[PDB]
Amino acid sequence: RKETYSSYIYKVLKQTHPDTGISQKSMSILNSFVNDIFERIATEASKLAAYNKKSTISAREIQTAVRLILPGELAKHAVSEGTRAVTKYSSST
Amino acid sequence: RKETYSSYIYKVLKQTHPDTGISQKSMSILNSFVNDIFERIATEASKLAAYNKKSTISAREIQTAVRLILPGELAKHAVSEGTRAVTKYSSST
Amino acid sequence: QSRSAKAGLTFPVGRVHRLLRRGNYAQRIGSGAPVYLTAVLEYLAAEILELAGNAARDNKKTRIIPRHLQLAIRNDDELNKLLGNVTIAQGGVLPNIHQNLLPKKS
Amino acid sequence: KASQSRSAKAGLTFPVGRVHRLLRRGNYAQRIGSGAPVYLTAVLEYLAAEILELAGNAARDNKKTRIIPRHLQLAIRNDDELNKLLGNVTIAQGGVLPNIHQNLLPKK
Amino acid sequence: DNIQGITKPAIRRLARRGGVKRISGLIYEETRGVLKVFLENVIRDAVTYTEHAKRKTVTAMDVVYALKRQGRTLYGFGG
Amino acid sequence: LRDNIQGITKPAIRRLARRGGVKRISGLIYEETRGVLKVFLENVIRDAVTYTEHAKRKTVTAMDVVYALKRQGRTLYGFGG
Amino acid sequence: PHRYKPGTVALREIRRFQKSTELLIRKLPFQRLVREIAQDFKTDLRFQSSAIGALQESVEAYLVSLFEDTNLAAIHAKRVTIQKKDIKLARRLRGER
Amino acid sequence: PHRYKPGTVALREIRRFQKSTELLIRKLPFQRLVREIAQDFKTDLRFQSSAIGALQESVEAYLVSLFEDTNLAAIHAKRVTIQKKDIKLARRLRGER
DNA sequence: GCACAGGATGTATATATCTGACACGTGCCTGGAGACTAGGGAGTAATCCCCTTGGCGGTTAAAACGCGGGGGACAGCGCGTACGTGCGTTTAAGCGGTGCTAGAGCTGTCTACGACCAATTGAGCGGCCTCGGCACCGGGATTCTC
DNA sequence: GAGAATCCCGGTGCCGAGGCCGCTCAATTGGTCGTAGACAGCTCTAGCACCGCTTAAACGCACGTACGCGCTGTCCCCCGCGTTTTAACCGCCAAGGGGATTACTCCCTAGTCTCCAGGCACGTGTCAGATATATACATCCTGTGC
């Protein structure tokens, strides 16, 4: 029993494209892609949390990390939508 | 209260070259070198132990980390001196 | 009720929070951090699948092939710059020809 | 009952307790074995000893006494194993390598 | 004869995939030497993973981690 | 605006080239190399200032800059302690 | 009695190769080479099937990336032919030592 | 009087600079450069002096490595004189854009 | 036009002074070592089943080989031109000095965010099933090409 | 102007990518408490700004010379194609050998209190450049006559 993001990336696609199909090896491309990006951003977050002698993981250091590892117009767009998501999560407490 | 490796590396060069001074900029080179080597070998041994689904860092995966990271001839010298160090440690009789 | 619903997102804040929990990064992890992480992965996945779907619609194909993934990831210079050290399985090369590799004149 | 540390019990001069302390709250794993700090102490001792052998030999080739970082740069970059080990590093106050390509000389 | 297994039309295929018009004839053996030093690195990088995993067969995931370690990471084979 | 990109003077690019071991330097290379200096400069200092603004400091210390060199694989020694 | 110009059929097979994306090394000799280099380290190493494909896609990817850069090196020397000094030029400028 | 052949003193100052250790740029134009190129990201941003020295030795190491690589690129091209296309070729082969 | 004598001058080498950059003896404090406890992680072992390597054999695109030719590397050679050399003329880092002053950092104190434990329910993973998107085979229009 | 070589369209299965049910862990909910971070306060380090004089260094102009580069005939060694052979490719059997998976048990290592000495931070005694006299002695510059 192993875990992946099959139904979730498929629901994202069927939200944006109700007609395009996905090969399973293409989906393995996307899975290795998404957890690769996850591992980079989480490792940078771990470093920059330890760098400022902080023992806790929070939103501000992954914020700084996603500005610094994502460059232009995928930095500011991701920051904007993620701030929207965390505000709509905190408002819906 | 500050942390370094100054006295230890100091007696390392005194035990083989006693008529040799050391510069504090050079000593900062040396401290940054040993810190960089430490963090490289430790994070690669940690990532390698995460491959195994092993939650424990033992000597076997860090000597594996030596063989991955350090170049081969000094790697086998390093593992030779590491084995005599841990066998001299294990002889608590 | 699922916390992905109360954040309005479709990637698993519980699962990525659990993976971050054994992710072995620090002794404590905040609540909004997997939410923000899920959001940035959701936006980035949405953009890469948007480019892949547009590349699929350009070449009359309704199934995603990794060739179409390579055409989607390498045409955009930003994603080319972020994926510069990464190669794609069965990807291929963008057709690029230097101007004097074409022979003759006019 | 009075006993000394485990650094000399391992026969080593770097602090095994300090590098063990950095192994706990470096949060690389939640469980650390006993042989990992003594082995890491040993390998850091070996690399540091090799570095100071090369630095001392460079300083005696320059017949100095105090290790200028020029000596460290020539100790690292004139040995090939350290060149692959330290390829992407820059050493402060280190300078560059004395090398001349053979075409640049006035061959006449 | 086992060493020369990568044949001359295969270097031709890789070169025209690279988009090169004219090929000099002394390329091919040194390109073979380039292969036998490049994949040398990842065989060393993967069999150490395999023996530390207490296994004597390799798989996709550990050599993908070897490629990730040496900077040319690959997708689609797990990882 | 000011003599700031061109403040790195014309014999200085020459001297840096002679540190590498060149002989002949064309005259039109100086503004291009100044462009090279500046284009390396913003994408090291943006990492430096993101590390700075996370620390809630509005001075840039010597530590976050050398970890910003550590970011892209151009690690540096001496100011790491 | 027709003979085609050098540069017609060659350029058209570069185009036909660039539209295609299939593997170019024959998989069985490459399988022989990876086994015969692997047995020098640990005898009796079994091999997973897709690991060979992963190695193959890595080595076509790296050789294509090397060949494009060496073509750039050769065309920078006002030449349409690559050469082994252009190979070592690309390897030094890649920093592959 | 008696002069020297051109290029003979060029190698003399080559070995003088490669014998040397100190830094070859004045600190103040660098400092104004980083102040006027860093103010766009954030205003009134003060600086540690040794951070400026770190920026110094990092960028001078990048420039001497790039100039050495560009010299190799130029000498591969049957020349000693270094041109714009040598810079473009070198920046294409180190990979950065 | 050349040899001889008088004056100037480095200079060598021994002290004295005299400053400037190093290794070594005491407070101190805090973190490493030792003893005890506890619990869960890895080691081992036995079985299960999956897959992986031979092992045929047919067959088939593909490589080795050589032959004719033709475009491209190449040494040379003229020609100009573009950067190295040199020196007058600003000039702008630089040192150091001072004056100020704002922010880094350390401590104190609170409180609020999350680790942790007991309980819950749901949803995604996986075997099974359906079927239609598309590679493939054959025929026709069309494109650079000599 | 011909002709292989492309794109484009019609007929063949087919087999690998979407639906569909079971349900098992694993996301989600509620209560506790201690601690690490958030805010206030205070100090001192050091970062910025400017005065003023220095001078090594840079800018600018004239020259001139080795090298960048355009052309030109020369191989000559790379490229297009028939022909064979040959080793790659595919279908499929097998078998056994190795990863996977559960379970139990030890032992090995996290967590806590005590302490005391290891390793600092911070003073002083101890060797290398620089200036300076001094005085005879060898060596060089300079004035002069035959």
Residue numbers in the entry:
A (entry chain D), B (entry chain H): 36 to 128
C (entry chain C): 16 to 121
D (entry chain G): 13 to 120
E (entry chain F): 25 to 103
F (entry chain B): 23 to 103
G (entry chain E), H (entry chain A): 38 to 134
Which text from the study accompanies this structure?
However, amongst these remodelers, the INO80 chromatin remodeler appears largely sufficient to generate the well positioned +1 and −1 nucleosomes. S.c INO80 is a multi-subunit complex consisting of 15 subunits that are divided into three different modules. The catalytic module with the Ino80 (ATPase) RecA lobes and insert, Arp5, Ies6, Ies2, Rvb1 and Rvb2, constitutes the core unit of INO80 (C-module). INO80 slides nucleosomes with 40 bp of flanking DNA ~100-fold slower than nucleosomes with 80 bp of flanking DNA, displaying a switch like response to flanking DNA length.
INO80 complexes lacking the Arp8 module (ΔArp8) were purified from yeast strains lacking the Arp8 subunit, which results in the absence of the entire module. To test this possibility structurally, we determined the cryo-EM structure of ΔArp8 INO80 bound to S.c 0/40 nucleosomes in the presence of ADP/BeFx. The overall architecture of the C-module of ΔArp8 INO80 bound to 0/40 nucleosomes is again similar to that observed with WT INO80 bound to S.c 0/40 and 0/80. However, the density corresponding to the HSA around the Ino80 motor domain that was observed with the Arp8 module in WT INO80 is no longer detectable. This is likely because, without the Arp8 module, the HSA region is either poorly structured or highly dynamic. We interpret the absence of HSA density as indicative of an activated state, where the HSA is no longer held in an inactive conformation by the Arp8 module. In contrast, this deletion resulted in a ~75-fold increase in remodeling of S.c 0/40 nucleosomes. Thus, the Arp8 module plays an auto-inhibitory role on 0/40 nucleosomes.
